[PDB]
Amino acid sequence: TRDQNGTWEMESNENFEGYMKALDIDFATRKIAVRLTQTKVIDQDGDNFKTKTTSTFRNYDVDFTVGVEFDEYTKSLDNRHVKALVTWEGDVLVCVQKGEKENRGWKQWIEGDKLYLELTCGDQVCRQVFKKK
Ligand SMILES: CC1=C(/C=C/C(C)=C/C=C/C(C)=C/CO)C(C)(C)CCC1
């Protein structure tokens, strides 16, 4: 169902490098970042989300309200401005990031005690799995 609250520790990371390549993240950053285990912290209250994604290298925080379009500045990533919109499709949390890159966004959902994240940009898809701590 729709409750994504918790501290979530990465179990699997697939094609993170291709996704970052599609974002044109620089070589040295990609090569370090592809090594790392991530932790995701999600505070969800009704439609209000506060998320922190953490690694030993760099963190990325984004806050949003479901159904409310917002300007996302991807400073720790590819450093672009996108117009993001997060909505529910069934119990899948879907984000479209409109801007320079085509097909850019992500989908996040819970199955049991695991959180699944699919990150897309261009023709690249990264798939992550996290275990609830
Ligand atoms: C590329 C890249 C990273 C990946 C960040 C990502 C992919 C965060 C996704 C946020 C989402 C989907 C929030 C949903 O609640 C980190 C900062 C780890 C290391 C440096 C470069």
Swiss-Prot record:
Name the record gives this protein? Retinol-binding protein 2
Which domain of life does the protein's organism represent?
Eukaryota
Entry's Gene Ontology cellular component terms: cytosol; nucleus
Coiled-coil stretches, from where to where? none
Q: What is known of its domains?
A: Forms a beta-barrel structure that accommodates hydrophobic ligands in its interior.
Give the gene symbol.
RBP2
Location relative to the cell: Cytoplasm
Q: Provide the taxonomic classification.
A: Eukaryota, Metazoa, Chordata, Craniata, Vertebrata
Q: Describe its function.
A: Intracellular transport of retinol.
Q: Tell me which tissues or organs this protein is expressed in.
A: Higher expression in adult small intestine and to a much lesser extent in fetal kidney.
Classification via PANTHER family: FATTY ACID BINDING PROTEIN (PTHR11955)
Q: Which GO terms describe its biological process?
A: epidermis development; fatty acid transport; vitamin A metabolic process
